[PDB]
Ligand binder design. Structure first.
Ligand code: CDL
Ligand code: CDL
Ligand code: 3PE
Ligand code: 3PE
Ligand code: 3PE
Ligand code: 3PE
Ligand code: 3PE
Ligand code: HEM
Ligand code: HEM
Ligand code: ZN
Lengths: 487, 74, 116, 49, 147, 455, 32
């Protein structure tokens, strides 16, 4: 009388699903003998072997550093100047960026058209960019053709010629570039956050500067800026790939001679008008935008602060989450799990920025207008949890992730050269991989708690928000969420 | 012309001006006080604790015994 | 110990009584698992096929209607009833095993019960 | 009970303001902004009483 | 937002209604202190209830014992004069605060639409206060009370 | 605790001795597992190892039943297996600190994983598990299908990929015509058991290559043989066929500009190494740009199209000239994005350029030299980034059964000449025009009107 | 985490005992 499971399509479906479940119930050890999802430390000392980065200091004060690997076939040669938009004078804000744009063009013999023709004829690339307090002009080239690239860099950095018609054309180009940046909302958010956090300080002003100032260059400001800030002690030449240190040193010595001898040293320049964090907020409500983008930030650590590594670990254990992330609801960080499980945000990203004598540390969320209060609760809860109740497995996972991220990012010739120059400018030395790993391994739960108490516990925050933000909690909400009354 | 509220969106400045009619702003370099405030709040808080204890004890001791009963205790 | 109706007369009688009751109301033993009760049953039902879950809802509605009317299933369908032909225990076990693993190593609960 | 109904009806239709105008543009949460104002009022009343 | 795992206790169902109506209720940003007077009237009502309960733990509603019972509260009960003076002067302050409440409503025309029901329930409340205070003033059983 | 302020070396470290400054150039070892599988590796100096598993499967092997399995499989790459749950897999990857990626192309598709050189057994074991033993659960597949439907709903934002797919579908018939982005009907039809059957039928040993970038070959083979040697030996069913004859695809969308693209056949394919290299050099000569970039010299601003069109014709949003080469077939052509009113003139200009390269004498020796040097530079600067090295190993072994040494590509690019360029352009222009248009297409010329040229 | 949790619980217990003594000042219990 009772029907068999063959009939009753629901009985058939139940049988099929039960068969599949009983299929996947028995694991296998030969595919599980190495997994160990619980994180643990390891000593990669047997692996961290890289060629020595030879450093030389020409007596005019010029540092040249190379990491040669003569088995390769390409190379990257560049100049890393310790100057940027921070070192302006409140009326020449856009000078650094505009000088970049101009210095691409022409010299007493380069003739921008035929200069770029030469660059593209040898097959290489030539790029540049300016940060708040760092400037880079680098070129990627091949073996036996490095010297031409080095000569071109020296020529453009020393004997550049600025002509009025090209200056007008670049004024037009930079006004267009300013008009296209508001589409990129993340950069706008971070510019506003910098302005409202380091207000009344040289770090507050943007990189591009104001259009009213870009319209009044006249090339006298350009020449004055280059002669006052591109001095010999503040520059570093870096090379990787198939290069020879002695050849590079000889070429730099023979070429970089018409420099700007001066005394404006960035250390003394930062001694005056330092960077001062001021807790505040700016919130630009629109309600015509589909997504609300905001960022909260605490005061960070300087480049040389020994707690900078701890802050890097902490921003690794608040790792970024994305709506197309592979992990999804399963991730190491508690903040990513909270965001993904309850789907309260389109994407979150924790950032750690380091400057001289200051820095930043935040979470950069981007969500929908209705989940903002829950998202803010999640962010503040996880940060103050880092203050109070950090866990050993989380710390170990964060340290492993940080080591892996750094060593995987250093990949190629241009990344190696960029690492050499940036580290030489920030610390005065290039930190070896073994020492970097030792410093990271010196971070444990007690270290994380101490650093978070130093930087997060009951400290002012700076908020920058844009879009439909009616539901975003006010300043007092975040300010009170920076501590727990339970402990 | 520029609607003057997108000008502020497109032009972030490091010199931000607040109202300063009800509250004078500290000069930028000065630190956040954050301690004077908590100590003022603490003084008021233990004033409040004193008040609450007074009220509770008044009610309970009123519900307690009485002088005529204590006199008749013999 | 593990006492089954083959090796226990008392268990045989217990199973017989449960079969009689469920057949009277015409609903499988797994249909008694309340999704609001555990929230693991809620997930297991969320993972099951729609045909199976719809059959479960139909059987439950029939049982509730019979309960209101103060009557039992007619003897034909009562003889056609198949209690203890499970459809949920394997999925529930998988869900609980996954939850146990996630809790055991790090991890936040994928779902939680409101208060209350 | 009457006071609770009073408050429920008010909470249905918001709250007036010294201007008498529509006031759904600039609105803030009751706590902590008006709890502290009410607290100042309560302490002054306690001194009077 | 799907509430899979609970974020905040205030948004949990146990404290959700309280959350909305006490913490998260949007309020006009420019309110002066007379809205504080409304809250103060609420506090005065609570004070009256508590002191009245503890007073009724000692008051005898008989005609031959009411007055001497009140004098008992004043003289014998431990801190009873405080209870009685709090009850009486708290009735007075309750009425003072409600009068200021009403006159702010009149000044700012808060009775206008759509708060007609709020004003009407307020009128009912005022009637209840009048009746309660009158019957309470009869309780001590003095010359003014009786007459 | 005290710390040395990070501008001073940290106390006592056991930092090791550096590499010998031009140690050597590692060779690729390839071992053929007797069931028919390939395991290849090479040594790298950097502390990062990239390990990938590449399969000869994809849209070409799709079937009317599947029709979308490749895209779904890319989305369902590192999900729960019969031995580990998805949570366990993600926790393992995070624990060692590596990155997982999946790529799905028309002809072949791969799964890559990156981590430090210490974790080689973990990398290879997790990869082999996730490929060989997948458990396509209905709920996970449904989640990924929902995401894929949303992505299909957000497709028009990039007209270039849409036009590439359109050109392939229009100008091919069966195999290469099989779509890559899983239309909505196919998405609704797709299912977990369908994925299971497709994988079990296609993911077989004689079409699997495991390529490592910074891993010792002995270690890799010693950890991979106990995980792949027992796969069944199958007879490697033949590759699908596809003919080129094809015409026009036209789709109307928003009012912002029109995107027109043209393409041709060049039936050499990757097995015709000389013609593939000549096609790559021709692409690097043609190239172009988007007229909105502000990077700097070297990005091809002196290419022929860039110079002529962009420096001469304005109101043309972007102008590029591209190629796509599959085993035994090719597809080279020009992408144009311009204003709706200008579109017929834009088509005329693109045809003029494509015929200009064909007729002899119109390409200068200096331009050819620049193109050859740029191609050599692009290849060389690409073979850094060990991820690219491992991918190249895998793709080359899948195609040719070996790794063709870089010196062959360099020599071919060296020996290409103007006569070769002209002959290849003449051959490529003879094949029937393939045309696609997207946007305000109600004003672009007819396919036959455009095809009046080129013949 | 357990040492921190038990330390915090003990601190809250000390605070609770102090509040209890403040509410009910008992020298009668304090002296012995
Ligand atoms: C009661 C309702 C709240 C329950 C707790 C919920 C909670 O989490 O609260 C904290 C919670 C913090 O926000 P959150 O979003 O949960 O974030 C939590 C943090 O991540 C983390 O927050 P946290 O961990 O720092 O704080 C957790 C909090 C949670 O609270 C507790 O655990 C308290 C436990 C009971 C203690 C009993 C003693 O614990 C404490 O505060 C510990 C305090 C221990 C000592 C308390 C003093 C004892 C004195 C005797 O909410 C608040 O702080 C808001 C409270 C708002 C109160 C509004 C009162 C308005 C009054 C208006 C009066 C006039 C109206 C009109 C009158 C007339 C009408 C007619
Ligand atoms: C008739 C004589 C009229 C003389 C008017 C003089 C004058 O210019 O007054 C306006 C002038 C400020 O004008 P406003 O800005 O329009 O009023 C303040 C706002 O209401 C905003 O007030 P606020 O929150 O900035 O200040 C808080 C606090 C500041 O006051 C204090 O801290 C202590 C005040 C002690 C007064 C005795 O209180 C006040 O300012 C006054 C309101 C006090 C609360 C009343 C609530 C109702 C109580 C009902 C009880 C039951 C009946 O206030 C004063 O002159 C008072 C302060 C005088 C110096 C002492 C400062 C001590 C620290
Ligand atoms: C010790 C008790 C051991 C019980 C072992 C299982 C018995 C199961 C069973 O069928 O028990 C018989 C009966 C209930 O079954 P049934 O006869 O179907 O009742 C409804 C119709 N008369 O009755 C019961 O189940 C009564 C059980 C009483 C248990 C009391 C324990 C103290
Ligand atoms: C009588 C003398 C006085 C002393 C009495 C002492 C207590 C004796 C009895 C103790 C009973 C157990 C007490 C502990 C609470 C229950 C523990 C528990 O298991 O809670 C978990 C449960 C579900 O939570 P779950 O989803 O598991 O959490 C996610 C974590 N991964 O959590 C829930 O389901 C949440 C339940 C919410 C409701 C709890 C109600 C508790 C009782 C309150 C009574 C008073 C109510 C207030 C009004 C009157 C005030 C006087
Ligand atoms: C002590 C005096 C406490 C007074 C609390 C406020 C008055 C009771 C309100 C009860 C009520 O209606 O709660 C509704 C809520 C239903 O649950 P939910 O779906 O979250 O509803 C949100 C509203 N849309 O109900 C619930 O979730 C249950 C709430 C139980 C009551 C808790 C009161 C606080 C106890 C401490
Ligand atoms: C109404 C009053 C508040 C009732 C709170 C409990 C409500 C019912 C249980 C709710 C669920 C629960 O466990 O809540 C406790 C809460 C959990 O923390 P949560 O923010 O949810 O997430 C972190 C995960 N562990 O944990 C917390 O929020 C932490 C609170 C810890 C408080 C411990 C300290 C108490 C000290 C004694 C009292 C004060 C001493 C001084 C005064 C003494 C007496 C005069
Ligand atoms: C809750 C009930 C508290 C009851 C209580 O503490 O009653 C007070 C009683 C007598 O203490 P008391 O009269 O203040 O002291 C005599 C001189 N010091 O207290 C005692 O007899 C001892 C109280 C010890 C602390 C009890 C805390 C509960
Ligand atoms: C038991 C005494 C009373 C209590 C506890 C009480 C309580 C409150 C409370 C809590 C509010 C909201 C907060 C505020 O706006 O101040 C309020 C508002 C109001 N009450 Fe009362 N009230 C009382 C008596 C009255 C009376 C007698 C009237 C007039 C008949 C009245 C009329 C109003 C009005 C018009 C408002 C609206 C407030 C506004 O417009 O902003 N209330 N009351
Ligand atoms: C349920 C709560 C209340 C109780 C149990 C209560 C009880 C009492 C008792 C027993 C008395 C006589 C004691 C005495 O003579 O001092 C009294 C007096 C009085 N009550 Fe209340 N009462 C309550 C609330 C109120 C309220 C809300 C009011 C209104 C403001 C009020 C107004 C009065 C007045 C005016 C007196 C006479 C004051 C006097 O003794 O001279 N009572 N109440
Ligand atoms: Zn620029």
């Amino acid at each position: 009388a009772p029907p068999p499971p063959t009939a009753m399509i629901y009985d058939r479906a139940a049988e099929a699903i039960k068969s599949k479940l009983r299929q996947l119930e028995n694991p296998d050890p030969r595919f599980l003998k190495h997994g160990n999802p619980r994180p643990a430390l390891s000593d990669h000392t047997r692996i961290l072997a890289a060629p020595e980065t030879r450093v030389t200091t020409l007596p005019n004060g010029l540092r040249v550093a190379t990491e040669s690997s003569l088995a390769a076939r390409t190379a990257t040669v560049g100049v890393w100047i310790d100057a940027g938009s921070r070192f302006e004078t409140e009326e020449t804000n856009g000078t650094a960026h505009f000088l970049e744009h101009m210095i691409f063009k022409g010299t007493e013999r380069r003739n921008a058209r035929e200069l770029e023709e030469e660059i593209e004829n040898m097959g290489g690339h030539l790029n540049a960019y300016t940060s708040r307090e760092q400037t880079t002009y680098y070129a990627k080239v091949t073996d036996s053709d490095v010297p031409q690239a080095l000569d071109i860099l020296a020529d453009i950095l020393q004997n550049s010629r600025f002509e009025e018609n090209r200056i007008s054309r670049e004024r037009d180009v930079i006004l267009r570039e300013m008009e296209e940046v508001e589409g990129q909302t993340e950069e706008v958010i971070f510019d506003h956050l910098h302005a409202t956090a380091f207000q009344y300080t040289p770090l507050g002003r943007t990189i591009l500067g104001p259009a009213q100032n870009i319209k009044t260059i006249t090339k006298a400001h350009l020449q004055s800026y280059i002669q006052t800030h591109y001095t010999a002690p503040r520059m570093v030449i870096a090379a990787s790939g198939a290069v020879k240190h002695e050849d590079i040193v000889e070429q730099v010595k023979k070429l970089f001679t018409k420099l700007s001898t001066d005394a404006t040293t960035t250390a003394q320049l930062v001694a005056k008008e330092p960077a001062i964090f001021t807790g505040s907020e700016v919130r630009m409500l629109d309600d015509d935008i589909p997504l609300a983008q905001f960022a909260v930030a605490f005061e960070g650590a300087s480049w040389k602060d020994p707690d900078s590594i701890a802050l890097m670990v902490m921003q690794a254990m608040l790792g970024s989450w994305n709506k197309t992330a592979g992990g999804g609801k399963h991730m190491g960080s508690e903040l990513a799990q909270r965001v993904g499980i309850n789907e309260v945000a389109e994407s979150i990203m924790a950032f750690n920025t380091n400057y001289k004598d200051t820095g930043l540390f935040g979470v950069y969320a981007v969500a929908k207008p209705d989940c903002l209060d829950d998202l803010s609760y999640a962010i503040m809860q996880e940060t103050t949890k880092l203050v109070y109740r950090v866990s050993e497995d989380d710390v170990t996972r964060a340290c492993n992730q940080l080591k892996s991220s750094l060593l995987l990012h250093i990949d190629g010739t241009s990344p190696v050269a960029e690492d050499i120059g940036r580290q030489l400018l920030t610390y005065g030395r290039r930190i070896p991989f073994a020492e970097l790993f030792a410093r990271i391994d010196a971070v444990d739960a007690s270290t994380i708690k101490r650093v978070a108490n130093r930087f997060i516990y009951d400290k002012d925050v700076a908020i920058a928000a844009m879009g439909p933000i009616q539901r975003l909690p006010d300043y007092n909400w975040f300010r009170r969420r920076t501590y727990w009354n339970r402990y | 012309e520029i609607p003057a509220t997108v000008a502020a969106v497109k032009n972030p400045s490091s010199k931000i001006i607040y109202d300063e009619h009800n509250h004078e702003r500290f000069p930028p370099g000065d630190p956040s006080k954050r301690a004077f405030a908590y100590f003022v709040l603490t003084g008021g808080r233990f004033v409040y604790a004193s008040l609450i204890r007074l009220l509770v004890l008044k009610f309970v001791l009123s519900m307690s015994a009485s002088k005529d009963v204590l006199a008749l205790a013999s | 110990s593990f006492l089954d109706p083959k090796k226990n007369w008392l268990a045989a009688q217990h199973m017989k009584s449960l079969v009689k009751r469920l057949s009277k109301y015409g609903l499988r033993y797994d249909d008694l698992y309340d999704p609001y009760y555990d929230l693991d049953v809620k997930e297991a039902l969320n993972r099951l096929p729609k045909e199976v879950v719809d059959a479960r809802h139909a059987r439950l509605k029939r049982a509730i209607d019979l309960s209101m009317k103060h009557e039992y299933l007619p003897e034909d369908l009562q003889a056609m009833q198949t209690p203890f032909r499970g459809y949920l225990q394997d999925m529930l076990a998988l869900v609980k095993r996954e939850r146990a693993e996630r809790e055991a190593l790090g991890g936040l609960p994928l779902y939680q019960r409101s208060i209350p | 009970g009457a006071s609770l109904l009073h408050l429920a009806a008010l909470h249905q239709y918001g709250s007036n303001n010294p201007l008498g105008v529509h006031s759904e543009m600039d609105q803030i949460s009751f706590y902590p902004y008006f709890y502290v104002k009410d607290l100042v009022g309560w302490v002054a009343f306690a001194i009077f009483f | 937002t799907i509430r899979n795992q609970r974020f905040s206790l205030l948004k949990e169902p146990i404290s959700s209604t309280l959350n909305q109506h006490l913490i998260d209720y949007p309020t006009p940003s420019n309110l002066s202190y007379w809205w504080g007077f409304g809250s103060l009237a609420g506090i005065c009502l609570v004070i009256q209830i508590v002191t009245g309960v503890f007073l009724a733990m000692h008051y005898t509603p008989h005609v031959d014992l009411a007055f001497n019972s009140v004098e008992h509260v004043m003289r014998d009960v431990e801190g009873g004069w405080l209870l009685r003076y709090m009850h009486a002067n708290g009735a007075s302050m309750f009425f003072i605060v409600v009068y200021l409440h009403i006159f702010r409503g009149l000044y700012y025309a808060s009775y206008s639409s759509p708060r007609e029901f709020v004003w009407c329930l307020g009128v009912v409340i005022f009637l209840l206060m009048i009746v309660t205070a009158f019957t309470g003033y009869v309780l001590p059983w003095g010359q003014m009370s009786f007459w | 605790s005290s710390l040395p302020s990070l501008d001073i070396p940290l106390g006592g470290v056991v930092l090791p001795d550096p590499l010998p400054d031009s140690v050597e150039q590692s060779k690729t070892k390839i071992t053929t597992l007797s069931n028919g599988l390939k395991i290849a590796s090479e040594t790298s100096p950097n502390p990062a190892a990239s390990i990938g598993l590449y399969l000869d499967c994809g849209s070409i092997y799709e079937t009317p039943f599947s029709s979308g399995a490749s895209h779904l499989l890319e989305r369902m790459a590192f999900k729960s297996t019969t031995n580990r749950s998805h949570f366990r897999i993600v926790r393992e990857v995070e624990a060692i600190g590596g990155n997982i990626g999946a790529s799905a192309s028309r002809e072949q598709m791969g799964y890559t994983f990156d981590a430090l050189k210490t974790y080689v057994p973990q990398m290879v074991e997790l990869l082999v598990d996730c490929v060989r033993n997948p458990a396509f659960l209905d709920w996970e597949v449904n989640e990924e299908l929902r995401k894929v439907k949303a992505e299909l709903g957000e497709l028009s934002n990039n007209p270039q990929g849409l036009l590439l797919e359109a050109i392939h579908s229009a100008g091919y018939s069966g195999a290469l015509a099989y779509p890559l982005l899983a239309p909505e009907a196919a998405l609704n039809r797709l299912d977990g058991p369908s994925l299971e059957e497709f994988v079990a039928e296609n993911y077989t040993a004689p079409r699997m290559v495991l390529a490592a970038a910074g891993v010792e070959h002995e270690e890799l083979v010693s950890i991979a043989e106990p995980l792949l040697s027992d796969l069944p030996n199958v007879p490697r069913p033949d590759e699908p066929k596809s003919v080129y004859v094809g015409g026009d695809f036209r789709r109307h969308g928003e009012s912002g500009g029109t995107h027109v693209a043209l393409a041709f056949e060049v039936p050499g394919g990757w097995h015709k190494e000389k013609d593939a290299i000549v096609l790559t050099v021709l692409q690097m000569l043609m190239g172009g740009g988007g007229s909105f970039s502000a990077g700097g010299p070297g990005k091809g601003m002196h290419s022929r199209l860039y110079l002529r069109v962009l420096n001469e014709y304005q109101q043309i949003q972007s102008f590029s000239a591209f190629n796509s080469i599959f085993n035994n077939t090719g597809l080279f052509g020009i992408y144009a994005s311009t204003s709706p009113d200008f579109a017929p003139k834009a088509v005329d200009i693109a045809a003029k350029e494509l015929i200009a390269i064909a007729s002899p004498g119109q390409v200068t020796q200096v331009q050819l030299d620049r193109a050859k040097k740029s191609t050599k530079s692009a290849v060389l600067m690409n073979l850094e980034s060990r991820m690219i090295a491992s991918e190249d190993i895998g793709r080359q072994i899948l195609t040719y059964g070996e790794r063709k040494p870089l010196e062959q590509f360099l020599k071919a690019v060296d020996e290409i000449t103007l006569n070769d360029i002209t002959k290849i352009s003449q051959k490529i222009i003879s094949s029937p025009l393939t045309m696609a248009s997207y946007g305000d297409v109600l004003s672009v010329p007819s396919y036959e009107s455009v095809n009046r040229k080129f013949h | 985490i357990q040492p921190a949790d038990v330390k915090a619980a003990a601190m809250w217990g000390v605070a609770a005992a102090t509040g209890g003594l403040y509410l009910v000042q008992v020298s009668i219990l304090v002296l012995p």
